[PDB]
Amino acid sequence: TASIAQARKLVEQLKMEANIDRIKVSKAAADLMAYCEAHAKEDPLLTPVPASENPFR
Amino acid sequence: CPEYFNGVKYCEPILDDKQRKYDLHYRIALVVNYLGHCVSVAALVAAFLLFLALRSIRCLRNVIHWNLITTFILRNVMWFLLQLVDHEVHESNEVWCRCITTIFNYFVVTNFFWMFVEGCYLHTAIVMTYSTERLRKCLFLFIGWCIPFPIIVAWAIGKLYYENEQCWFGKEPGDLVDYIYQGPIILVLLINFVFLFNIVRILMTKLRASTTSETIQYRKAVKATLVLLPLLGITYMLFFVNPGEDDLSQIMFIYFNSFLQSFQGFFVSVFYCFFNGEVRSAVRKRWHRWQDHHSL
Amino acid sequence: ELDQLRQEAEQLKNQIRDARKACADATLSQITNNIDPVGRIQMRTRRTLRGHLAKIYAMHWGTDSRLLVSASQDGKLIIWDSYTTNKVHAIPLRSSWVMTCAYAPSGNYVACGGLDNICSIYNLKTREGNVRVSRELAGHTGYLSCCRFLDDNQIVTSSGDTTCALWDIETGQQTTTFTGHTGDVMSLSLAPDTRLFVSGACDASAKLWDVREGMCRQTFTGHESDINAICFFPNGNAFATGSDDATCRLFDLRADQELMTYSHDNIICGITSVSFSKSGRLLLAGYDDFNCNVWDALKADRAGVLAGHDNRVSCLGVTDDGMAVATGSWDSFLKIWNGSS
Amino acid sequence: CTLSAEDKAAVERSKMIDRNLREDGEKAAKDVKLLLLGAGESGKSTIVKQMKITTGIVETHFTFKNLHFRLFDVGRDERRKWIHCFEDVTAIIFCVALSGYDQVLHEDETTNRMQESLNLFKSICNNKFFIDTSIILFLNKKDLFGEKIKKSPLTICFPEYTGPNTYEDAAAYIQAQFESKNRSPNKEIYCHMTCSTDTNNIQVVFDAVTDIIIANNLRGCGLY
Amino acid sequence: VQLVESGGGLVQPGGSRKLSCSASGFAFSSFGMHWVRQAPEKGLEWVAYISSGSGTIYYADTVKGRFTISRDDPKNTLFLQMTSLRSEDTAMYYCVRSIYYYGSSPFDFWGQGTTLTVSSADIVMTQATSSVPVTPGESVSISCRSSKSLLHSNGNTYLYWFLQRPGQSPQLLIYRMSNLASGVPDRFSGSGSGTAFTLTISRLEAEDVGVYYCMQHLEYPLTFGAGTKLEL
Amino acid sequence: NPSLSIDLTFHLLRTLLELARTQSQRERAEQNRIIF
């Protein structure tokens, strides 16, 4: 009775995963673009730091 | 007749030119000796650069190899400096001639001691370990560099007092002060040979059941011996002492030892720097890294 | 009754594939043409940490961007000071095999686990002044692959028996369990708000688990090989997974499908560690060909290369302010890359 | 030298930790690692019971006259992704049972314990990490194989084999089939046949690990 | 954590005395060790320091050449051989443990003390106010001043604030002017510029009566504050 | 009679310097002969 129970559990899991609200790709891509453009000036890896401000140098 | 007239001893002139031997063979030995040293330096400088540019390999093996290459380089430079001496400086003793002879002898003793260091490291690896790697490195560096200083200084002091003539390398009948540094080295090489002999046992005992093909076992033992010989300094032991009286033997002596001595650094440099897999791997990796940096 | 169950499951997976094909109005690579390229990223090694005699397996940065933990095969858990290369702590370990290590956000506790199946949590601030064992967590039947601190009280752990577990360090028992995988779960990456977490396993599928509720919400299957490392995006909407097929993929949570696939024709080597930058424009991937690559996350083109290690890169970490990137590899060196102008 | 007093004391503490790590590495360096990778029905429990006299990795410390062996037992891993940890071992102790050719697997598929052992040994030999490492093979349960071989001919286990049902002949054939699998000249399979009650196993292991260490030294020096 | 001093008494001038400090309940060998002397009517005065592992030894200028500090790590004991004892040596001697690493709290435990009774370049620490009469519930602000700036290039300012309660051991209050010591309630606070520092009490209670010391830890030899007593 | 392999270079140098000194002395004797 373990195989039928595991089958029922996987059916319930696919039921849970199917009934979700999915946002379109364009809107979330725009949101990621906005976040990466807004936070682009505070990134030391993306924009290099002068040696006086840089603590490692 | 005058006794000393225009620097010729005497009116019939007495000249040593009658009691003279074949001269052209020495000159051809000189040409082979210069060519051996020049090609040796041309390989050793490249090995010196390829054992400093590559930081991936830092084990004690490559450190002793790099120090041996360094000692070969410095004794070849001293050899080139020492060669430009004429009969005038050989007759009238000068400071710089004796100084360059002393330094050259120091680098010779240092080279044979670093060969001893190499043999000791190889024995400590193959047979058994007596101490930690840090004390190995300290003891090896100490034997290679600090130990030649008292022997060379004591030899220089004894030579200065007892026999202050002919730029400290003239052999007179009855000289015994030149055995101060030669004496240990002749022992040292023998010790190396004993070490080498032990290696010749350890390989063969391993090569018994390894491969059933007898011919491959003999060829592999020969191939291992012919590459352990130049590194341990057993080449000098190949034709150690030849009586001067014999002529043909003497010519063979001069040409054979002139060929072995001059190209020894060349063999060590080429085979150990290039034929070793690790150095080729490191070079190939750094070439891939350079190509990857250039392409992007 | 297995036949109608398998048919219903195939119908549900067809419905999910249809929904994912319907939601895919446009791709990400098309709309990033207007965006300017990042260009060359020249990074050089600032510090080099050499206190390990064996291969390093993992590392973790502190919240103050000052200290870092590193675990090694010889049985040492060394806590370094990255600026002046001073060893702040060195913890001798019971089991030599330690495959993961984590540093508390408060900075008091350090956990470590491995093949001994026990998660050992050590305390760094005591009246005696000597680090000692504080907690031992033993409730798994597989090897512990990763662990991360939600807080001082609770630690999320991932094991090799296809399970994840939320542990309470005070009581010493499993609060809730996460059993949805079929392969060995290799790595996890917490969200910044500690609400959800993602988990990649050896079934070539990542799951989105909820901490409080304890049930799987989303499943992402786009890899052809085992997933080795995972890194959650900072804003709380995407994540990225690295696999052995020389691909790392950026997945979206709200779109419920993959966004972008970072791959290269000359690279045929596995990915051991992934991490994002502070803004999330640079994707750092530790490949198996002895060097790391800096990918542009919006343009999908190889921006830079970090080539300083002799053996394969095992672990990679970025500070919270994003000042420098520490890389550990199997040649027993921690190298701190940083970029200047 | 432009440092405060606390920074200097921290550097001295770091030097103390460096010396302690150096001493711990010097103590650790003189130990030999052995991997006991085997099947469930292999009879490796008999092997550890002979070497000596818990879900985690079992660790066994047994010392000979001059060398200290440290054996590691793992136990239920389908694909064994943790194998990369055991790259630094000098030898793998791989044990297979001779009595297992009769008994089929629990699944009842057309596979034999010997065939599964051959597949596992082929996966070990073909593994990228284990190309340097050598294998020490122990053929356990000689008595049961010797008894069973009279009743049952060795035809079901090896169809290609066409030989008489002789204990020595068949044992040599099984040893040849196990030695056939490797295609690397670097590693050498050290085969030895064991039993339930034996005391020479420690000697066999000491001789084999000695041979492997000498061969590794010679290969490192470039001679072998 | 227990430190017990012994070897005190009443001596004649010129005599020798071997002092002992018995440590228990902690890792003695990982901690550097300090001798600090307090005169009966004067403030605390540093004597000596030995590092963990005995590699590094520091003495005071006046104390140099007459006192020998040593430590026995397997027996967990600190020794101080004293020779040529003058009249100024009559003091309460304290044994102190201290560990130095990033984030640590040095000078976090003070011994019980033993009684001995005999029959320029240095940074000067100045507390111009010797005493302040206080009432419970108010907010106090005591100041300290150094002759040298205590801001170092790494950003730390090596200033420690101590409390010596009457008839009890000294107690650490503020370490490095930005960190609260373990076990100290959060009503205390420190705030200062490069040369002028201020310890601020909010809602002073009964147990806050005692002497406050400031201390520079910028460079050796250590020099202490003159001490500020709180009157009721 | 002792001609060691390690002392080859000094033996060659002494032989060549002796030959050079014999040639120089013979040319100097021919100059003395033309003087006579």
mmCIF file with all atom_site columns, N, CA and C in Angstrom, chain D residues 2-10 12-13 16, chain E residues 51 53 56 99-100 152 154 158 160 217-218 220:
data_model
loop_
_atom_site.group_PDB
_atom_site.id
_atom_site.type_symbol
_atom_site.label_atom_id
_atom_site.label_alt_id
_atom_site.label_comp_id
_atom_site.label_asym_id
_atom_site.label_entity_id
_atom_site.label_seq_id
_atom_site.pdbx_PDB_ins_code
_atom_site.Cartn_x
_atom_site.Cartn_y
_atom_site.Cartn_z
_atom_site.occupancy
_atom_site.B_iso_or_equiv
_atom_site.pdbx_formal_charge
_atom_site.auth_seq_id
_atom_site.auth_comp_id
_atom_site.auth_asym_id
_atom_site.auth_atom_id
_atom_site.pdbx_PDB_model_num
ATOM 1  N N  . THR D 1 2   ? 54.238 49.651 11.738 1.00 0.00 ? 2   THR D N  1
ATOM 2  C CA . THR D 1 2   ? 53.291 50.661 12.215 1.00 0.00 ? 2   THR D CA 1
ATOM 3  C C  . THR D 1 2   ? 51.979 49.986 12.624 1.00 0.00 ? 2   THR D C  1
ATOM 4  N N  . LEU D 1 3   ? 52.058 49.213 13.705 1.00 0.00 ? 3   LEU D N  1
ATOM 5  C CA . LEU D 1 3   ? 50.916 48.484 14.235 1.00 0.00 ? 3   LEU D CA 1
ATOM 6  C C  . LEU D 1 3   ? 50.795 48.733 15.731 1.00 0.00 ? 3   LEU D C  1
ATOM 7  N N  . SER D 1 4   ? 49.560 48.676 16.224 1.00 0.00 ? 4   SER D N  1
ATOM 8  C CA . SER D 1 4   ? 49.300 48.804 17.649 1.00 0.00 ? 4   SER D CA 1
ATOM 9  C C  . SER D 1 4   ? 49.719 47.535 18.394 1.00 0.00 ? 4   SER D C  1
ATOM 10 N N  . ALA D 1 5   ? 49.633 47.607 19.727 1.00 0.00 ? 5   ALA D N  1
ATOM 11 C CA . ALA D 1 5   ? 50.038 46.491 20.579 1.00 0.00 ? 5   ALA D CA 1
ATOM 12 C C  . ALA D 1 5   ? 49.113 45.291 20.408 1.00 0.00 ? 5   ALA D C  1
ATOM 13 N N  . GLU D 1 6   ? 47.799 45.543 20.319 1.00 0.00 ? 6   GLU D N  1
ATOM 14 C CA . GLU D 1 6   ? 46.826 44.473 20.103 1.00 0.00 ? 6   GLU D CA 1
ATOM 15 C C  . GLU D 1 6   ? 47.062 43.760 18.777 1.00 0.00 ? 6   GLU D C  1
ATOM 16 N N  . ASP D 1 7   ? 47.404 44.515 17.727 1.00 0.00 ? 7   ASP D N  1
ATOM 17 C CA . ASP D 1 7   ? 47.696 43.913 16.429 1.00 0.00 ? 7   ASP D CA 1
ATOM 18 C C  . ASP D 1 7   ? 48.936 43.025 16.491 1.00 0.00 ? 7   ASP D C  1
ATOM 19 N N  . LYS D 1 8   ? 49.963 43.458 17.232 1.00 0.00 ? 8   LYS D N  1
ATOM 20 C CA . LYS D 1 8   ? 51.173 42.654 17.400 1.00 0.00 ? 8   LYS D CA 1
ATOM 21 C C  . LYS D 1 8   ? 50.883 41.373 18.171 1.00 0.00 ? 8   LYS D C  1
ATOM 22 N N  . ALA D 1 9   ? 50.100 41.478 19.250 1.00 0.00 ? 9   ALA D N  1
ATOM 23 C CA . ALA D 1 9   ? 49.688 40.298 20.005 1.00 0.00 ? 9   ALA D CA 1
ATOM 24 C C  . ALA D 1 9   ? 48.843 39.353 19.153 1.00 0.00 ? 9   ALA D C  1
ATOM 25 N N  . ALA D 1 10  ? 47.995 39.906 18.278 1.00 0.00 ? 10  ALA D N  1
ATOM 26 C CA . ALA D 1 10  ? 47.214 39.083 17.356 1.00 0.00 ? 10  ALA D CA 1
ATOM 27 C C  . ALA D 1 10  ? 48.111 38.351 16.362 1.00 0.00 ? 10  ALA D C  1
ATOM 28 N N  . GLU D 1 12  ? 51.188 37.475 16.979 1.00 0.00 ? 12  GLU D N  1
ATOM 29 C CA . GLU D 1 12  ? 51.883 36.441 17.749 1.00 0.00 ? 12  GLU D CA 1
ATOM 30 C C  . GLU D 1 12  ? 50.968 35.253 18.037 1.00 0.00 ? 12  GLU D C  1
ATOM 31 N N  . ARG D 1 13  ? 49.684 35.523 18.296 1.00 0.00 ? 13  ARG D N  1
ATOM 32 C CA . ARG D 1 13  ? 48.694 34.458 18.434 1.00 0.00 ? 13  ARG D CA 1
ATOM 33 C C  . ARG D 1 13  ? 48.543 33.678 17.133 1.00 0.00 ? 13  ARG D C  1
ATOM 34 N N  . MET D 1 16  ? 51.386 31.355 16.893 1.00 0.00 ? 16  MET D N  1
ATOM 35 C CA . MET D 1 16  ? 51.137 30.204 17.763 1.00 0.00 ? 16  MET D CA 1
ATOM 36 C C  . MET D 1 16  ? 50.199 29.200 17.099 1.00 0.00 ? 16  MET D C  1
ATOM 37 N N  . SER E 2 51  ? 53.206 37.488 27.317 1.00 0.00 ? 51  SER E N  1
ATOM 38 C CA . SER E 2 51  ? 52.327 36.993 26.271 1.00 0.00 ? 51  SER E CA 1
ATOM 39 C C  . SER E 2 51  ? 51.999 35.516 26.489 1.00 0.00 ? 51  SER E C  1
ATOM 40 N N  . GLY E 2 53  ? 52.411 31.880 25.519 1.00 0.00 ? 53  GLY E N  1
ATOM 41 C CA . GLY E 2 53  ? 53.559 31.199 24.964 1.00 0.00 ? 53  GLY E CA 1
ATOM 42 C C  . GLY E 2 53  ? 54.900 31.748 25.402 1.00 0.00 ? 53  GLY E C  1
ATOM 43 N N  . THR E 2 56  ? 56.998 37.001 24.521 1.00 0.00 ? 56  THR E N  1
ATOM 44 C CA . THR E 2 56  ? 57.065 38.458 24.534 1.00 0.00 ? 56  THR E CA 1
ATOM 45 C C  . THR E 2 56  ? 56.777 38.966 25.940 1.00 0.00 ? 56  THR E C  1
ATOM 46 N N  . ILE E 2 99  ? 43.182 38.380 26.620 1.00 0.00 ? 99  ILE E N  1
ATOM 47 C CA . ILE E 2 99  ? 43.372 37.786 25.302 1.00 0.00 ? 99  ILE E CA 1
ATOM 48 C C  . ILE E 2 99  ? 43.180 38.878 24.254 1.00 0.00 ? 99  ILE E C  1
ATOM 49 N N  . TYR E 2 100 ? 44.022 38.856 23.222 1.00 0.00 ? 100 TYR E N  1
ATOM 50 C CA . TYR E 2 100 ? 44.021 39.885 22.188 1.00 0.00 ? 100 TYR E CA 1
ATOM 51 C C  . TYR E 2 100 ? 43.722 39.241 20.841 1.00 0.00 ? 100 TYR E C  1
ATOM 52 N N  . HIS E 2 152 ? 43.818 55.433 16.096 1.00 0.00 ? 152 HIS E N  1
ATOM 53 C CA . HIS E 2 152 ? 44.801 54.745 15.276 1.00 0.00 ? 152 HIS E CA 1
ATOM 54 C C  . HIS E 2 152 ? 44.288 54.687 13.839 1.00 0.00 ? 152 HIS E C  1
ATOM 55 N N  . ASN E 2 154 ? 43.785 52.203 11.940 1.00 0.00 ? 154 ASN E N  1
ATOM 56 C CA . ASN E 2 154 ? 42.842 51.125 11.671 1.00 0.00 ? 154 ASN E CA 1
ATOM 57 C C  . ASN E 2 154 ? 41.416 51.444 12.112 1.00 0.00 ? 154 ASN E C  1
ATOM 58 N N  . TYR E 2 158 ? 41.858 53.054 21.471 1.00 0.00 ? 158 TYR E N  1
ATOM 59 C CA . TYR E 2 158 ? 42.184 52.100 22.530 1.00 0.00 ? 158 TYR E CA 1
ATOM 60 C C  . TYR E 2 158 ? 41.994 52.751 23.903 1.00 0.00 ? 158 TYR E C  1
ATOM 61 N N  . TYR E 2 160 ? 39.834 52.214 27.551 1.00 0.00 ? 160 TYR E N  1
ATOM 62 C CA . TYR E 2 160 ? 39.039 51.323 28.389 1.00 0.00 ? 160 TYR E CA 1
ATOM 63 C C  . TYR E 2 160 ? 38.566 52.075 29.630 1.00 0.00 ? 160 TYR E C  1
ATOM 64 N N  . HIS E 2 217 ? 45.316 52.202 25.773 1.00 0.00 ? 217 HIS E N  1
ATOM 65 C CA . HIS E 2 217 ? 45.999 50.967 25.405 1.00 0.00 ? 217 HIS E CA 1
ATOM 66 C C  . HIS E 2 217 ? 46.659 51.122 24.034 1.00 0.00 ? 217 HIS E C  1
ATOM 67 N N  . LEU E 2 218 ? 47.117 52.337 23.724 1.00 0.00 ? 218 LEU E N  1
ATOM 68 C CA . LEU E 2 218 ? 47.685 52.604 22.408 1.00 0.00 ? 218 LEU E CA 1
ATOM 69 C C  . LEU E 2 218 ? 49.101 52.058 22.280 1.00 0.00 ? 218 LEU E C  1
ATOM 70 N N  . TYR E 2 220 ? 52.759 50.607 24.744 1.00 0.00 ? 220 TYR E N  1
ATOM 71 C CA . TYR E 2 220 ? 53.407 50.248 25.995 1.00 0.00 ? 220 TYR E CA 1
ATOM 72 C C  . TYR E 2 220 ? 54.545 51.221 26.311 1.00 0.00 ? 220 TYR E C  1
#
